[PDB]
Design a protein around this nucleic acid. Sequence first.
RNA 1: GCCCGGAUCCGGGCACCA
RNA 2: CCGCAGCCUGGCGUUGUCCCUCGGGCGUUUAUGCGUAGAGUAGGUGGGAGGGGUCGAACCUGUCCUUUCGGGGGCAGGGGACCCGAAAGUGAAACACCACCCAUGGACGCUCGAGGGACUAACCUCUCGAAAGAGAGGAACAACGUCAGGUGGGCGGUUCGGCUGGGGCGGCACUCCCGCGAAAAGAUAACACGGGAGCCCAAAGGUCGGCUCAGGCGGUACAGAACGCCGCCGUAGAGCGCAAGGGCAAAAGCCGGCCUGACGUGACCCUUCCAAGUACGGGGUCACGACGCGAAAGCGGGGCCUAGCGAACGCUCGUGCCCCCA
RNA 3: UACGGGGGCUAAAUCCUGGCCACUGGUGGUUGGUUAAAUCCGGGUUCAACCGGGCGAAGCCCCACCGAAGGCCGGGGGU
RNA 4: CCCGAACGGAAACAUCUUAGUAGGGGGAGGAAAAGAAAUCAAUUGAGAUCCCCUGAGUAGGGGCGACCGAAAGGGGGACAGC
Lengths: 92, 216
Amino acid sequence: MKVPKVIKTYCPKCKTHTEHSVSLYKGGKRRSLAEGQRRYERKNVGYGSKRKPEQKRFAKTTKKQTLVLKCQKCSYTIVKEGMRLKKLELVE
Amino acid sequence: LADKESLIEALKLALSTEYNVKRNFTQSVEIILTFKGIDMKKGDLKLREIVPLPKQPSKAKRVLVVPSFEQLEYAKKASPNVVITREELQKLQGQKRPVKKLARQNEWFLINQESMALAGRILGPALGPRGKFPTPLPNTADISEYINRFKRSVLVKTKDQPQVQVFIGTEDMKPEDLAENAIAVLNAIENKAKVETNLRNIYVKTTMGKAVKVKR
RNA sequence: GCCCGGAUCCGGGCACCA
RNA sequence: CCGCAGCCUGGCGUUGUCCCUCGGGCGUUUAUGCGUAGAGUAGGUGGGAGGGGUCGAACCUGUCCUUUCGGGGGCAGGGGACCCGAAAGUGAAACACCACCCAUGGACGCUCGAGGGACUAACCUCUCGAAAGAGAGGAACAACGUCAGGUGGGCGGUUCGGCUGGGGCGGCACUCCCGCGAAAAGAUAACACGGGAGCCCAAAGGUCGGCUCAGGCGGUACAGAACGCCGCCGUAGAGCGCAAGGGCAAAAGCCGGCCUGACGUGACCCUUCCAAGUACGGGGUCACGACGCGAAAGCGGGGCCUAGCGAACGCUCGUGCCCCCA
RNA sequence: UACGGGGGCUAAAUCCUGGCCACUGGUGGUUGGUUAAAUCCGGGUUCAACCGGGCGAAGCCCCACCGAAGGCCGGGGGU
RNA sequence: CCCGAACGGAAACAUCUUAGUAGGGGGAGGAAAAGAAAUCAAUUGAGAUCCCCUGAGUAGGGGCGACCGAAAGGGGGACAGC
């Protein structure tokens, strides 16, 4: 599905409708020193079995496509709810 | 990034024969840039600034200015090297070397705001990699004061290297006067960015000298 | 998510606790 | 599904003395450069039309090294003194001198490694010796300790779904949607019957205007059942993304104009889930703020309606602040 | 002390023991890719944690050989 | 004082719990062990160790599941120091 690069929606910081630049969401690096990564490493020291459950059965084939909209006057960003699609063709 | 008294010591090497040779003509001081760790892509070496040097060396540079009929009797008092009139600059069509020769030797090619759109079609391709930027002139009657800004100003630009070779002065000023010639350049680079970490050694030599050391 | 090679895709070896 | 031994390999320790080589760096040292247009080797940024000139130049004649033998770079003598342009070409010119860069090779002092060789005194093996000690061979490797990667049913712990005209094999009646079963309120079972979903669309979404569809008949060159034009009829026999059912004609269909309400925050209600507890999901009605389209009333938090979806903990992003200690 | 110690398969003698190295397994090799800890370099932190880069053994990817190694020994069309 | 399980529970089970338990080895005494701050807490205070009632199923650990789990302080018993 095709989506424009620029969309005019409500900027809640500016309190009016402004232009936004559209991009797809992408996550960051896992960042060792996160509290749940410090705890996992503390659990893997010593002897034992595999410590934690790991997923093996997979059913879905797509992923929810999320749109990221940045207000072009104040850089305020609104993140929208995702929707299961193949690959959002963001070309204008 | 240099000390207050470092510049005087910098010119002391330049003026004295310990880092200079006195030939038949008066020496001129020049600075070459030597840095480390700069790339073109990062978009920080956008050196396209000008410096209003207060101290004027006795040897004037090749400064070219194009006035209009408004001030045809104001630009002749500053003794420019070569000046071409707006009414007859369009005659250079077809000519290539006269376009090239009297645009690179000259420091500037100032053109009025009326002919601003004409200042990118004739000298545009001819000075693409060369790096000449025509600065618009005030539309007032007085232009010599504006030309006085450009009599000893230097046009700095870089495209693919982190170094620029420029004129800074001569042998004819006071030893402490280079602290006023280079302060405009030092303040200009200070007020646009701060890359003092990338510096390794600054060479402030004369026309016919060798590499010197600046305390840092 | 990587490196690398090959025409955004493919291949090889390693990264990857809902 | 996982673990653990054993084995293989690398780092650190026990572990020491002499070299040589190579590769990195640090402060130095230096001499070497042809996409095309052209006096011809423009590799680039600048000062710089002056630079060299008894403050000894252009020029013939050879020894010599080299190269895309293109051509330039250095030799003293014969010459007792001359050439580049401010002039002609180049998206970027002056062998006019001086600087840095890209880029070749070598050398000084220091550091880091990596490799190779030798040696014997650690260590090991054997012999003699009651022991003390002596001799021979290997040798900074092996061996051992510790850490890291690989291999590893050798050994240990475990898991080996459900429904079901017995179980198994098969199927999925295991989540969701339509018709019928279903007996004219509501609820209702079958390994009952007929089938579908796990998405697609920046328009197939919002609004405003104009128009009328399938099929048939009469008249027209190519023209034919089926091209365009002029008329008559046509309750829908069409179309509405996709199953089935329902709905729709100055439209909910077809064609256009302008748009992004497929909007930020916060509630309530229906269904899933009858009366009678109940997670998600889906839908409906609004308040505040701001828009779009319309002359306007107004319509619009997606698709004409009923399917297209997922807890805790963990990670991550958005958004304004709160906290970190005897 | 190889005319040996250890480990497999077959099963006296007679006549014989065919073709195949694609897969798995074993052995060897390597232009090359990937490759842990440690060490080295850059950033960051008045120091660290933390981010990168380089170097990177065995193994794996790749190549060759081996059937008295496990073993396997079809179909279609035409004359 | 060292070495050191499984059954069971988690409605399966491997981290976990069971439990430093059961058990094994070494060493005493009428009691052992501990014991005179390189301690606590917080506007500059207390004052060696041990035991009881509390603080308290609190802080906190955990397939953040089943579950596990302090100390300071307060009230007492004895209250030495070399």
